[PDB]
Amino acid sequence: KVFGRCELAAAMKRHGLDNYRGYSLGNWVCAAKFESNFNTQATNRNTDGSTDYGILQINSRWWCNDGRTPGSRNLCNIPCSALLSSDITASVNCAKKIVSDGNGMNAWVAWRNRCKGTDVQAWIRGCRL
């Protein structure tokens, strides 16, 4: 499923992301934009044999099990296929685990280079939330 901007802001808000570990709703919407263009079915294969899954492009090496990645740690305790549902819940729950660590949202390369330090509140402007 490809989410509208405001539809996504709503679902993320509903799932408890606003100000989660100090990151405002706009940071999360901006991350999803540049990671996946709001597409829940986005996939991207990597060199090391791993794959990034779903709306926030979460990687199979540490965070989810796809059965195709050597030494997967599955820290979010989910099959990577869960990250490809039209329902964003699994991606949010995994994102919460990822962001709770020292690296914060810096774990997401596209957030770090496109959203970090910008006027991210713009990403929820217009939305009735």
Count of domains forming the chain: 1
Distance in angstroms (rounded) separating the CA atoms of residues 121 and 129: 13
Which residues are annotated as part of the binding site for substrate? Answer: 101
Choosing from 18, 52, 66, 87, the catalytic residue is 52
**Residue pair 115/30 in contact by the 8 Å Cβ criterion:** yes
Q: Does 66 qualify as catalytic in the annotation?
A: no
Which residues are annotated as part of the binding site? Answer: 101
Q: How was this structure determined?
A: X-ray
Structural domain harbouring 22: 1-129
Distance in angstroms (rounded) separating the CA atoms of residues 2 and 105: 22
What is the structure's resolution, reported in angstroms to one decimal? 1.9
CATH number at residue 53: 1.10.530.10
Choosing from 35, 48, 66, 87, the catalytic residue is 35
Q: Does 7 qualify as catalytic in the annotation?
A: no
